[PDB]
């Protein structure tokens, strides 16, 4: 598949970087191997595929192997975002496996090393994410230099600078929104635009278009396409994060409420509760972000569906997907791209995991 | 001066990036401003100046303003290394000022925000360092694209990939050396080669040569020059870190012993004590890395000078500086570069701060 072809290009790159760094010893090599295992250990490769479809939309052909490696840099950049997000959220596990800070704290304990095991695991996790990010940029630098016309390089760099600036801004805005207890739908929408719309949809698409041709019309259209679809993707995550079945999502039931995230769905519930039951709005305001029992969580989930926040979320998702498909249909891109991205937009809007 | 010209090029770049990101709101803007204040808030600009002299060594002229901005990327990359090092070391202050995690935890408290103030400060500090590093690479990408011949770009990228790979490896090796209690002089020398020789001397020099011309002879010579001088720089830090006067160094007396660093000087003291007093070696082995009173620290410092570790360190510094000046003198570079770098090598070898 195309995800597998992009994965193989990343697998070969990391193996080369790992061999070239072997002179730094077996401890650093074990760090690089742990990065390999984490990156190549599966995933949908959603962001590289968005770059692939952004390439097909305005290109006459299929891309060279080096351009697939450029797309794979989004996957390595995502490892950086995830590794540092696990430190930010203080998560113990990710997709069933221990987070980096726990793996390296356990390595510390297994060898009866001195000092705090948790300080070591946190330090090593910082450096692991840092490594993923410098190597992700090394891919962009190397592919640009050796495989792209100088015009394609300039367009690729502008997208590369935007995607990393916007994901960093989205992360900081998100932790500020939780700390300041920003209730508004606008605050959550602003974070979703940077963390989901830009970082997951719009900028990946534009990376592919930038690598293919100078199509400023298509770049601006994918901005509007990613704005609707990304917010639809985020709202889907918010519904799953509250009402998802753990056997289907793999996340604990009502994880967003347990973790105190400031989502659009939660923000809309507070607004709808102000309209229909002030005491229900008071329950939400004074419970979000606090240590909740499983009873409190189930109670808050019923209140969220009660005030109609779930129905409003599902209505928004349909509307944003419809307008995203409308934007995609009347677009000066190849019909093959229109069909591929319409498949993705439907899957992202209506999934259960 | 040249440090001021490089600083001004960085000041203008960050102001441009900050204006271009203003649409993300006042909270992220406050983060960018804090990065400005930290980077531009002083410094010797040692690594950019090494890139400057590496440029003069093989160039017929003085560099364009954009090439000075490329040199300033080393200063922004250093902000990343310092911000994440403060999290790794759990330092409360740096050069008199609060570290990032303390500034942002205090911002959290000042606004009566919710959650853990320290978790927020740690999260914000991670993102601050991340920002400095993506923007440092954005400088290298932008200057390469718009100011360098494609041959100069390829040489610059190879140095850029090495310096960030080696500083990351040096950091990980350093925390592994402290956790595993690696006593040997070789372990400390290995860390010093990556953290000091490569990251501070060799790679900065090579960045300047790479931006000027294809002089593989000079690049290999600066590798040998930075190997002697960097280890001399590190040994100077180790002596200051144990025997430095706080009024002169600005660090607390015997900071390296208080912080439990695995330095060459400490490693040599354990080896010399094995030779002259096993019980003194036992005192060092069982005290390094532990919580020490000020009496213990002063006792350990006397033991270090007793076994002659300080004299051995000062002898090594003179020898490495002599061979570094010998390497510099018989080098196919401009005589102006030879005089400038000889000034730096003397200052780095014999300083008190
Ligand atoms: C891409 C970024 C910035 C983080 C990825 O993790 P998520 O965004 O899915 O995780 P939470 O913030 O929901 O915990
Ligand atoms: C460049 C790097 C990796 C860190 C800079 O700080 P120092 O190296 O001077 O700090 P310590 O490790 O001695 O605490
Ligand atoms: Ca998070
Ligand atoms: Ca998370
Ligand atoms: Ca999320
Ligand atoms: Ca340190
Ligand atoms: Ca330090
Ligand atoms: Ca040091
Ligand atoms: Cl909406
Ligand atoms: Cl030596």
What is the DSSP annotation of A215-228?
-HHHHHHHHHHHHH
Same-domain check for residues B161 and B126? no
- Cβ–Cβ contacts within 10 Å for residue B110, how many? 9
Question: What does the alpha-carbon distance between residue B251 and residue B245 come to, in Å, rounded to a whole number?
Answer: 8
Q: To test ligand 1's pocket by mutation, which of A166, A195, A256 has the most ligand atoms within 8 angstroms of CB?
A: A195
Task: Report the number of distinct structural domains present in chain A.
Answer: 2
**In this structure, is the dihedral angle defined by the CA atoms of residues B142, B148, B149 and B154, taken in order, positive or negative?**
negative
Phi, psi of A97 (to 5 degrees): -95, 155
Question: Strand locations in B222-346, DSSP E?
Answer: none
Question: What does the alpha-carbon distance between residue B224 and residue B200 come to, in Å, rounded to a whole number?
Answer: 14
Q: How far is CA B201 from CA B205, B207, B224, B225, in A?
A: 6, 10, 10, 8
Same-domain check for residues A155 and A140? no
Question: What does the alpha-carbon distance between residue B233 and residue B243 come to, in Å, rounded to a whole number?
Answer: 15
| Nearest C-alpha neighbor of A145 from the set A156, A136, A153 | A153
Reduced to 3 states, what is the DSSP secondary structure of residue B93? strand
Element (H, E) at B3: helix B2-20
Compute the nearest-CA separation of B71 from chain A (Å). 18
Do A210 and A219 form a contact (C-beta atoms < 8 A)? yes
Do B320 and B228 form a contact (C-beta atoms < 8 A)? yes
Question: What does the alpha-carbon distance between residue B268 and residue B304 come to, in Å, rounded to a whole number?
Answer: 9
| Nearest C-alpha neighbor of A266 from the set A285, A293, A245, A290 | A285
Question: What does the alpha-carbon distance between residue B147 and residue B149 come to, in Å, rounded to a whole number?
Answer: 7
Task: Classify residue A330 by its DSSP letter.
Answer: T
Same-domain check for residues B132 and B198? no
- Indicate which atom in ligand 1 lies nearest the CA of residue A171: 3
Do B29 and B22 form a contact (C-beta atoms < 8 A)? yes
Task: Classify residue A197 by its DSSP letter.
Answer: I
Q: How far is CA B126 from CA A120, A294, B335, in A?
A: 15, 32, 43
A95: left (phi over 0), alpha (psi -120 to 50) or beta: left
Question: What does the alpha-carbon distance between residue B219 and residue B204 come to, in Å, rounded to a whole number?
Answer: 11
Q: Which pairs count as long-range contacts for B294-302, CB under 8 Å and 24+ apart, including other chains?
A: B297/B253, B297/B254, B297/B257, B297/B258, B298/B254, B300/B254, B300/B257, B301/B242, B301/B243, B301/B254, B301/B257
Same-domain check for residues B201 and B117? no
Q: What is the resolution of this structure in A?
A: 2.2
Final residue in a domain of this structure, among A115, A147, A179? A147
Q: How far is CA A152 from CA A46, B153, B272, in A?
A: 23, 15, 60
Do B195 and A28 form a contact (C-beta atoms < 8 A)? no
Cross-strand pairs, A98 = A93
Q: Report how far Cα B265 is from the mean position of its chain's Cα atoms.
A: 18
- Cβ–Cβ contacts within 10 Å for residue B111, how many? 12
Q: Report how far Cα A79 is from the mean position of its chain's Cα atoms.
A: 10
Query: Given the structure tokens 């760099």, which residue do they identify?
Result: A157
- Cβ–Cβ contacts within 10 Å for residue B1, how many? 8
Question: What does the alpha-carbon distance between residue A143 and residue B136 come to, in Å, rounded to a whole number?
Answer: 19
Do A225 and A205 form a contact (C-beta atoms < 8 A)? yes
CB half-sphere exposure, A187, CA atoms < 13 A: 21
Same-domain check for residues B10 and B136? yes
Contacts of A154 in chain B (CB under 8 A): 145-146
Burial A67-86 (b: 16+ CB within 10 A, else e): bbbbbbbbbbbbbbbbbbbb
Phi, psi of A167 (to 5 degrees): -70, -35
CATH of the domain at B61: 1.10.600.10
Q: From which experimental method does this structure derive?
A: X-ray
Cβ-Cβ contacts under 8 Å for A3 (sequence gap 6 or more): A44, A45, A48, A49
Same-domain check for residues A25 and A129? yes
Query: Given the structure tokens 């974070």, which residue do they identify?
Result: A191
In this complex, is the C-beta atom of A65 within 8 Å of any C-beta atom belonging to chain B? no
- Supply the range of the domain harboring residue B122: 1-147
Lookup: tokens for A272: 């709808």
Same-domain check for residues B232 and B336? yes
Question: What does the alpha-carbon distance between residue A193 and residue A180 come to, in Å, rounded to a whole number?
Answer: 19
Question: In angstroms, what is the C-alpha Rg of chain A?
Answer: 21
Reduced to 3 states, what is the DSSP secondary structure of residue A315? helix
Q: Report how far Cα A83 is from the mean position of its chain's Cα atoms.
A: 12
A44 marked as binding residue: yes
Phi, psi of A169 (to 5 degrees): -65, -40
Question: What does the alpha-carbon distance between residue B193 and residue B230 come to, in Å, rounded to a whole number?
Answer: 7
Counting beta carbons within 10 angstroms of the beta carbon of residue B265, is it exposed (0 to 12), middle (13 to 18) or buried (19 or more)? Answer: buried
Reduced to 3 states, what is the DSSP secondary structure of residue A6? helix
Same-domain check for residues A37 and A133? yes
Element (H, E) at A98: strand A97-98
Cβ-Cβ contacts under 8 Å for B329 (sequence gap 6 or more): B338
Question: What does the alpha-carbon distance between residue A11 and residue A69 come to, in Å, rounded to a whole number?
Answer: 9
Reduced to 3 states, what is the DSSP secondary structure of residue B94? strand
Same-domain check for residues A97 and A11? yes
Final residue in a domain of this structure, among A120, A147, A174? A147
Task: Say yes or no: CB of residue A85 within 6 Å of ligand 1.
Answer: yes
Nearest by CB to B115, which of A25, A120, A179?
A179
Q: How far is CA B195 from CA A52, B100, B250, in A?
A: 39, 22, 21
Do B128 and B98 form a contact (C-beta atoms < 8 A)? no
Phi, psi of A94 (to 5 degrees): -140, 120
Q: How far is the CA of B85 from the centre of ligand 7 (A)?
A: 6
Between strands A93-94 and B97-98, the pairing is unpaired
Task: Classify residue B174 by its DSSP letter.
Answer: H
Given an 8 Å threshold on Cβ–Cβ distance, is B141 in contact with A157?
Answer: yes
Question: What does the alpha-carbon distance between residue A348 and residue A136 come to, in Å, rounded to a whole number?
Answer: 25
Cross-strand pairs, B93 = B98
Question: What does the alpha-carbon distance between residue A336 and residue A321 come to, in Å, rounded to a whole number?
Answer: 19
Question: What does the alpha-carbon distance between residue B50 and residue B210 come to, in Å, rounded to a whole number?
Answer: 12
Q: Report how far Cα A107 is from the mean position of its chain's Cα atoms.
A: 28
Q: Between helices A264-276 and A216-243, what is the axis angle to 10°?
A: 60
Reduced to 3 states, what is the DSSP secondary structure of residue A241? helix
Question: What does the alpha-carbon distance between residue A45 and residue B237 come to, in Å, rounded to a whole number?
Answer: 46
Given an 8 Å threshold on Cβ–Cβ distance, is A113 in contact with B181?
Answer: yes
Question: What does the alpha-carbon distance between residue B121 and residue B109 come to, in Å, rounded to a whole number?
Answer: 10
Do A47 and A204 form a contact (C-beta atoms < 8 A)? yes
Lookup: tokens for B252: 């607390």
Given an 8 Å threshold on Cβ–Cβ distance, is A165 in contact with B21?
Answer: yes
- Indicate which atom in ligand 1 lies nearest the CA of residue A196: 1
Reduced to 3 states, what is the DSSP secondary structure of residue B215? coil
Question: What does the alpha-carbon distance between residue A143 and residue B57 come to, in Å, rounded to a whole number?
Answer: 30
Do A324 and A228 form a contact (C-beta atoms < 8 A)? yes
Reduced to 3 states, what is the DSSP secondary structure of residue B61? coil
Same-domain check for residues A309 and A175? yes
Contacts of B174 in chain A (CB under 8 A): none
Same-domain check for residues A296 and A323? yes
Same-domain check for residues B212 and B120? no
| Nearest C-alpha neighbor of B198 from the set B177, B178, B175, B224 | B224
Counting beta carbons within 10 angstroms of the beta carbon of residue B177, is it exposed (0 to 12), middle (13 to 18) or buried (19 or more)? Answer: buried
Among the residues of chain A, which ranges form H helices? 2-20, 26-39, 46-56, 65-89, 100-110, 117-147, 150-180, 185-192, 203-212, 216-243, 246-249, 255-258, 264-276, 278-287, 294-306, 309-329, 335-349
Q: Dihedral angle at the C-alpha atoms of A155, A159, A165, A167, nearest 10 degrees?
A: -170
Phi, psi of B58 (to 5 degrees): -130, 10
Question: Strand locations in B182-325, DSSP E?
Answer: none
Task: Specify the residue with its C-alpha closest to ligand 2, atom 8.
Answer: B195
Do A159 and A206 form a contact (C-beta atoms < 8 A)? yes
Question: What does the alpha-carbon distance between residue B301 and residue B254 come to, in Å, rounded to a whole number?
Answer: 7
Final residue in a domain of this structure, among B147, B171, B188? B147
Lookup: tokens for B297: 């620290």
């Amino acid at each position: 598949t195309m995800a597998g072809a992009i994965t193989d290009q990343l697998r070969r790159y990391l193996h080369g970087r790992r061999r070239a760094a072997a002179h730094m010893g077996s401890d650093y090599d074990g760090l690089i191997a742990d990065l390999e295992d984490f990156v190549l250990g599966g995933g949908k490769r959603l962001r590289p595929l968005f770059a692939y479809w952004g390439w097909h939309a305005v290109a006459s052909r299929e891309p060279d192997p080096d351009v697939l490696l450029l797309f794979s840099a989004l996957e390595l950049l995502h490892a950086w975002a995830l590794v540092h997000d696990d430190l930010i959220d203080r998560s113990a596990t990710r997709r069933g496996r221990p987070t980096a800070q726990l793996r390296y704290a356990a390595l510390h304990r297994d060898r009866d090393w001195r000092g705090s095991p948790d300080q070591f695991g946190m330090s090593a996790a910082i450096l692991l994410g840092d490594l993923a990010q410098v190597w992700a940029d090394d891919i962009v630098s190397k592919v640009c230099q050796s495989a792209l016309a100088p015009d394609a390089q300039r367009r690729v760099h502008r997208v590369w600078a935007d995607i990393r600036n916007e994901v960093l801004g989205g992360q900081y805005l998100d932790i500020v929104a939780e700390a300041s207890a920003a209730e508004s739908i606008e605050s959550a929408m602003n974070v979703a635009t940077l963390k989901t719309a830009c970082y997951t949809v719009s900028r990946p698409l534009q990376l592919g278009t930038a690598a293919a041709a100078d199509r400023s019309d298509v770049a601006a259209i994918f901005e509007h396409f990613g704005a609707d679809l990304g917010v639809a993707f985020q709202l889907r995550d918010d519904v799953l994060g509250v009402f998802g079945d753990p056997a289907v999502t793999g996340k604990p039931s009502g994880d967003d409420l347990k973790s105190g995230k400031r989502t659009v769905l939660v923000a809309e519930a507070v607004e709808l509760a102000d309209r229909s039951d002030p005491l229900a709005a008071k329950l939400l305001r004074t419970s979000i972000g606090t240590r909740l029992t499983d009873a409190q969580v189930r109670e808050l989930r019923t209140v969220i569906e009660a005030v109609g926040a779930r129905a409003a979320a599902e209505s928004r998702i349909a509307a944003l997907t419809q307008r995203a498909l409308a934007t995609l249909a009347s677009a000066p891109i190849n019909a093959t791209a229109k069909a591929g991205l319409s498949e993705l937009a439907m899957m992202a809007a209506n999934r259960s995991a």
